[PDB]
Amino acid sequence: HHWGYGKHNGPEHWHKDFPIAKGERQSPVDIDTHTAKYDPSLKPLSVSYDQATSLRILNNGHAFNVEFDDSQDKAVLKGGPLDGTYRLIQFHFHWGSLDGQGSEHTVDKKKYAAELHLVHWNTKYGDFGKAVQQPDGLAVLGIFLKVGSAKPGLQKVVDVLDSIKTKGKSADFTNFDPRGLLPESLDYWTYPGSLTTPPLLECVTWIVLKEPISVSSEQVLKFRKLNFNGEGEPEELMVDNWRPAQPLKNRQIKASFK
Numbered sequence: 001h002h003w004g005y006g007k008h009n010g011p012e013h014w015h016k017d018f019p020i021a022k023g024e025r026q027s028p029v030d031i032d033t034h035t036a037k038y039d040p041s042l043k044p045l046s047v048s049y050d051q052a053t054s055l056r057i058l059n060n061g062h063a064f065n066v067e068f069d070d071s072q073d074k075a076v077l078k079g080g081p082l083d084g085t086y087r088l089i090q091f092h093f094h095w096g097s098l099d100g101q102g103s104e105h106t107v108d109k110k111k112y113a114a115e116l117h118l119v120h121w122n123t124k125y126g127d128f129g130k131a132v133q134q135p136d137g138l139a140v141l142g143i144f145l146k147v148g149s150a151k152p153g154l155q156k157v158v159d160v161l162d163s164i165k166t167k168g169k170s171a172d173f174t175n176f177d178p179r180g181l182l183p184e185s186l187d188y189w190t191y192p193g194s195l196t197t198p199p200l201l202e203c204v205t206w207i208v209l210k211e212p213i214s215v216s217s218e219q220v221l222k223f224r225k226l227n228f229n230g231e232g233e234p235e236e237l238m239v240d241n242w243r244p245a246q247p248l249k250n251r252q253i254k255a256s257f258k
Ligand SMILES: [Zn+2]
Pocket: 092, 093, 094, 117, 196
């Protein structure tokens, strides 16, 4: 009876194994666009993905992770609200059963069809496992997905999902360029928060881009054919793997743009 997204093991149950679920800096949150203050001191974000080395894609029973070689400063995030250099380790998505839900962060209570998280760790802590124990350990770049025109840079991900249908399956996923998943603008909101899955650690600087990317209905429908279960187990479609908005408490959301 491990955590998941169902009626019996979903977000409202997580607190019983992970009491930090009811903590002071939990994610995601609703972004109230009228309350978020423009902070002219915020720098443009620097996304340096030219040398990114993707290695593998994994169905981990909750989502799929595209994994990167983070043994050197190749793909890094810096600038924005960040001090120092943060290395890309993996990306994944959260998505719904229907286009009207799926995102974790919301914008004035609007839910997007899905949300991409590019997860990076602060090199001053030397490895990911150490970084998640620190308040400034991770920087997660959040990008909304809406359903419309296809995102060509996503299709290589969509087309491999067939080979990692079930929990514990993996596939070789080299030479994927995550710049193909970015929107045009790097305007963002930022706030201090947490991992949105257990262990729900309060170690993330969230950077949520204002501009969504568009993907096609066929693309997101392929996400929805994945499975939470393992091979030859009762099929449970991998949908609605998102945590709802959590209380903002004593936090300010800052906008990079006016
Ligand atoms: Zn995530």
